[PDB]
Design a protein around this ligand. Structure first.
Ligand SMILES: [Co+2]
Ligand SMILES: [Co+2]
Ligand SMILES: [Co+2]
Ligand SMILES: [Co+2]
Lengths: 329, 329
């Protein structure tokens, strides 16, 4: 009791977060895009309705909170998040930081300037809404670009100032987490404040246990992603990969079996609209996983239970770990 | 009489455009940036106040209309344009199209999809404002990227459908206008609907007269840009170049002397805020040219008059040419 986290509807007790999906999106887009071209998604109304249906389905399956890790450059629309959170009665934590599509007005900035921007979104509010970010999202896709180095350092500084955790996009097959870790530590950030994401995109347990041993949270956050059966579709192959959801889920058990149950976060990286990729990608995705953000509780958790993971351990992964992660520390 | 052009305050008779600067910016930024980080500019209020002072100064010097060629990805804020247009009593024509910083949500689009977006901004309105674009802005920086090829084709299609003209950013030293022309013509666009911009960034009159002979408008639109005296400042050198304003202005006379008076458009490429480049670039610029968008009428036009260009010819360049260009055709 007592600890608080900021959501798009305002402050909530940490203990009310409950079952929390730590890497999700209402909409994967671009800065200004939803405002400029809402017809891309049919309409804003259609997008919101789809999101509300999806979040209610997740809620019925036991999901109480999602962390929408859409940054400025993922076209995060905090008013949209607030509207759908309210309608579906599911808490949404919003993000600051920058992903891998920053516009020139961000790319030209210094570490000091980026720190001030991240601090604005955490401490003051996003845009003119007063809605405060509860997480900082950053990204590399291979070795960090010079700009990405500044972003990670600024993320570390903002986290140190506010206690808000940092979460990452990686190219997991290229083992980005190691350099990301090196940069964060150079700034004196505690590994327990950091989740190295898309870590289920690899089966390299040397890489993953290495991070977990150092105290990092390991984000196994793309559970339903598979292009098995869709190998004819090149864009789906590139995004979803050729590993089954079962293969991804086995990593949760593997980390638990190696003593790392407290270092695991599980999610889908799902969304209800998706303009930053090929047209109609959302239709492909909805076919692969009609359950959307209910997939983890409906499929993954029982799969793990049937493999012998104790209920207490599963509750620790889906409730206690997110609580500890999100609590400003 | 009769012909109309859309401005941020609504429709105006073409004959009321008067002395028109055809390539300008209220603010050079990025999509969503002004909404997310207005403190970058001091405040939105400060930015608007600066813009109103600047536009009133231009108006006092005889400027009646500017064409703000900020696209979506230059962070065009049409409400800001409308506010400052109203306060300064200077007409502002807004733009659609894409510059050279499109986010992924644009870069993934087809020519058909881009055409629909440009048509939306011209025919329906920008965002939810009902303000209609009166020009389409496109860009290359050297040989066109595959995406830029689609953008130029979509610009051509939108222009053919609406009669609204197209204007371009070039790397003038790399003679981009020739390929841009080739792409436009492949779509059946009339050269008289097109301005090849930043053409005063080069002294190559073979290149420029080649375009003018084909019927293109030649945009001599960076009149006050010079880093003479600032060679110690690397970012200023890269953006402003080492040629004097007099050297740029001589190109106006050179084209007139070669029979191309009707093919010339003159502007500053000025702005009142600038977040897509180095921090404090606006302070450097304001020192180079305290007159802002009054520089053309105060310095360039009298320079030309003193070189013997007849008043009728100068009026044809600054009034008749923009009128003919902007009139939907
Ligand atoms: Co990602
Ligand atoms: Co994601
Ligand atoms: Co330009
Ligand atoms: Co410009």
């Amino acid at each position: 009791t007592g600890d608080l986290i900021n959501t798009v509807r305002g402050p909530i007790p940490v203990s009310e977060a409950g079952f929390t999906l730590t890497h999700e999106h209402i909409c994967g887009s671009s800065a200004g895009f939803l405002r400029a071209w809402p017809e891309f998604f049919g309409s804003r109304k259609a997008l919101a309705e789809k999101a509300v249906r999806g979040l209610r389905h997740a809620r019925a399956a036991g999901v109480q909170t999602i962390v929408d890790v859409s940054t400025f450059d993922i076209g995060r629309d905090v008013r949209l998040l607030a509207e759908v959170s309210r309608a579906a009665d599911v808490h949404i934590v919003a993000a600051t930081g920058l992903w891998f599509d920053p516009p020139l007005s961000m790319r030209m900035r210094s570490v000091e300037e980026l720190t001030q921007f991240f601090l604005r979104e955490i401490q003051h509010g996003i845009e003119d809404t007063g809605i405060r970010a509860g997480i900082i999202k950053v990204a590399t896709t291979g070795k960090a670009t010079p700009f990405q180095e500044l972003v990670l350092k600024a993320a570390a500084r903002a986290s140190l100032a506010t206690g808000v955790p940092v979460t990452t996009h990686t190219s997991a097959s290229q083992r980005d987490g190691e350099q990301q870790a090196a940069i964060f530590e150079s700034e004196g950030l505690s590994p327990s404040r950091v989740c190295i994401g898309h870590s289920d995109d690899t089966d390299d347990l040397s890489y993953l246990t290495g991070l977990a041993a150092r105290g990092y949270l390991v984000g196994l956050d793309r559970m339903p992603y598979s292009a098995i059966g869709l190998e004819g579709n090149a864009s789906a192959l590139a995004l979803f990969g050729t590993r089954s959801w079962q293969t991804r889920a086995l990593l949760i058990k593997a980390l638990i079996d190696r003593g790392y149950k407290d270092r695991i976060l599980v999610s889908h990286d799902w969304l209800f609209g998706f303009s930053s990729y090929v047209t109609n990608i959302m239709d492909v995705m909805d076919r692969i996983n009609p359950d959307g953000m209910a997939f983890v509780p409906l499929r993954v958790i029982p799969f793990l239970r049937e493999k012998g993971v104790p209920p207490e351990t599963l509750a620790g992964v889906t409730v206690a770990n997110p609580a500890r992660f999100l609590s400003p520390t």
